[PDB]
DNA sequence: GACCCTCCCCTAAGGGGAGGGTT
DNA sequence: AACCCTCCCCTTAGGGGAGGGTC
């Protein structure tokens, strides 16, 4: 039976055939050694039976070619198995934020805020955790709590990049009496120096939301990743985090501020 | 910010974005005219952060340059919620066949069936509908059959590839009393003389076993795609069919036998 | 007329490397 | 040596077609 006729009786297409005879899966029985032809018997269609049952299954050529001649291989499947359940898992993760995508982008008819994942590894930070008023002082307190530090510590180099953070320690919405961890991360432990003191700050898994604007209103992007958060199966694992890309001391314009917000997540 | 430091703060690779300049997702805000060095700023990485947020919802690179080229695209992202619950639908049909498949594997070390779902194109046969009193009689009485719509018809050309099956449509087992129907692929209409007439078999999706050996173990592979079909939460739309591949007219080795069993299914 | 072969380029989203540049 | 660039080839499971030959 040539090609064409083979390629009818498994309804598939001739290059497939081809493409299997040169990666050596599904060999034909007879090559014409004048033209080249492939001649296929039934013998080659109870093979292709079964690629065709493990190509059904999700398994990737170079696995058939080892499930179809080792055949004893088992671990091959419960390896596709649990390949198959992250991606299900995975899967009804990006269907829950697809779901979550519509339902903001029907309330509002634009996207201001866009929540990402991304992992943010650890880092040897100089901290100096107090209470505050508000977050506009603050603001005012943070510049000489680090010139304190960059003084008092020869040698210590910021980290490139300028991560630069802080963390709320709160568990309900406060707007005063914030009980507020400031950071920067720096290369290297440095010696602790009165209230400031040094710590590792664990590597994180986060959804992430970048805010341009003014400071007075962070509070949009902390209500967005909270019902993130409570619509789309997370659970707040740490202490918010909040970064400074860009703010004051790198630009003029309040407009043009880019601080991002962090949530510390994990998966239920 | 040079590309290095763009790489570090945004956590992906330079190929990356290389590939995001080339293409046009992520162009720099300034690149050096002799050298070539891409410099970035702020607002590439508030752009970025845009890029990755979707990427995570597993939308294509094109549609991501059309979601944030051009807004109010709300149609693209129902495009990509059905695909993924089409996706997920596919998935989790996977990891039911998977989990069958290892059922039976660390059961028996050998695989006497794989089962495959393929959808079989409609066709037009002539049929012969009676009660068979049994199996190894019901081989005995094709060959009239076959004579005699070759005689009644002249000139009827029979498809190529022979489709040849056998129609049980017995809702119930039973050895004596069959009511099977024998039909035969052919290419056009003919004359409906006697009690074999012609008719169209509607195309079907079914799962297959092909069956090699004598025509006594066929109940081996009925019990086994029944379980299969139990076991994967499909149900049987239709009469099973018994396509005929290889018998006493090829060969004369009752062990070179070569026969399909197909299963009319849809997945409910 | 139909059918079949090898050879070449293409996919999506980058990965890896070679060779050249500059401070 | 540290970064930077461009250019070329590579990944899947085959698709599409050109040019040439065969039944
Ligand atoms: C959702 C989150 C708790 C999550 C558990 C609550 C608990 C503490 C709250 C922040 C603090 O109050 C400081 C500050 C007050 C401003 O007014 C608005 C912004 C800030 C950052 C607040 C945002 C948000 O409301 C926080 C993080
Ligand atoms: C599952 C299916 C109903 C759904 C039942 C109902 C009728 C049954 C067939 C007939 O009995 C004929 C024959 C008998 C042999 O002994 C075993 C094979 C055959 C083909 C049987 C297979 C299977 O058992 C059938 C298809
Ligand atoms: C030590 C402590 C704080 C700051 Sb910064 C800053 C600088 C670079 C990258 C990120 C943050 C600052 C403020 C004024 C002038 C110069 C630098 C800072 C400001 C507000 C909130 C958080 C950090 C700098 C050093
Ligand atoms: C018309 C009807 C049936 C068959 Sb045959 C067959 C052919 C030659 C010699 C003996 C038998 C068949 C099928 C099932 C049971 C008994 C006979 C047949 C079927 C498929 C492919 C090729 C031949 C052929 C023409």
Same mark, same amino acid.
């Given at each position: 039976?040539?090609?064409?006729?083979?390629?009818?009786?498994?309804?598939?297409?001739?290059?497939?055939?081809?493409?299997?005879?040169?990666?050596?899966?599904?060999?034909?029985?007879?090559?014409?050694?004048?033209?080249?032809?492939?001649?296929?018997?039934?013998?080659?269609?109870?093979?292709?039976?079964?690629?065709?049952?493990?190509?059904?299954?999700?398994?990737?050529?170079?696995?058939?070619?080892?499930?179809?001649?080792?055949?004893?291989?088992?671990?091959?499947?419960?390896?596709?198995?649990?390949?198959?359940?992250?991606?299900?898992?995975?899967?009804?993760?990006?269907?829950?934020?697809?779901?979550?995508?519509?339902?903001?982008?029907?309330?509002?008819?634009?996207?201001?805020?866009?929540?990402?994942?991304?992992? +943010?590894?650890?880092?040897? &930070?100089?901290? /100096?955790?107090?209470?505050?008023?508000?977050?506009?002082? #603050? =603001?005012? *307190?943070?510049?000489?709590?680090?010139?304190?530090?960059?003084?008092?510590?020869?040698?210590?180099?910021?980290?490139?990049?300028?991560?630069?953070?802080?963390?709320?320690?709160?568990?309900?919405?406060?707007?005063?009496?914030?009980?507020?961890?400031?950071?920067?991360?720096?290369?290297?432990?440095?010696?602790?120096?009165?209230?400031?003191?040094?710590?590792?700050?664990?590597? +994180?898994?986060?959804?992430? &939301?970048?805010? /341009?604007?003014?400071?007075?209103?962070?509070?949009?992007? #902390? =209500?967005? *990743?909270?019902?993130?958060?409570?619509?789309?199966?997370?659970?707040?694992?740490?202490?918010?985090?909040?970064?400074?890309?860009?703010?004051?001391?790198?630009?003029?314009?309040?407009?043009?501020?880019?601080?991002?917000?962090?949530?510390?997540?994990?998966?239920?």
């Amino acid at each position: 039976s040539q090609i064409g006729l083979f390629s009818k009786i498994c309804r598939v297409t001739i290059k497939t055939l081809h493409y299997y005879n040169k990666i050596g899966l599904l060999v034909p029985a007879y090559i014409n050694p004048d033209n080249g032809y492939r001649f296929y018997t039934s013998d080659q269609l109870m093979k292709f039976h079964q690629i065709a049952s493990l190509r059904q299954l999700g398994f990737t050529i170079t696995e058939i070619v080892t499930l179809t001649q080792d055949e004893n291989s088992c671990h091959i499947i419960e390896r596709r198995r649990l390949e198959i359940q992250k991606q299900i898992r995975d899967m009804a993760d990006m269907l829950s934020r697809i779901n979550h995508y519509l339902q903001h982008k029907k309330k509002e008819r634009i996207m201001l805020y866009q929540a990402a994942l991304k992992e +943010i590894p650890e880092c040897i &930070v100089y901290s /100096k955790r107090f209470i505050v008023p508000d977050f506009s002082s #603050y =603001i005012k *307190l943070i510049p000489p709590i680090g010139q304190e530090v960059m003084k008092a510590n020869p040698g210590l180099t910021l980290t490139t990049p300028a991560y630069c953070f802080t963390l709320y320690h709160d568990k309900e919405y406060k707007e005063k009496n914030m009980d507020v961890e400031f950071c920067e991360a720096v290369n290297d432990f440095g010696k602790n120096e009165g209230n400031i003191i040094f710590q590792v700050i664990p590597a +994180i898994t986060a959804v992430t &939301v970048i805010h /341009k604007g003014p400071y007075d209103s962070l509070r949009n992007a #902390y =209500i967005y *990743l909270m019902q993130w958060v409570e619509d789309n199966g997370y659970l707040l694992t740490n202490s918010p985090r909040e970064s400074y890309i860009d703010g004051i001391w790198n630009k003029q314009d309040s407009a043009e501020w880019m601080t991002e917000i962090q949530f510390p997540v994990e998966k239920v």
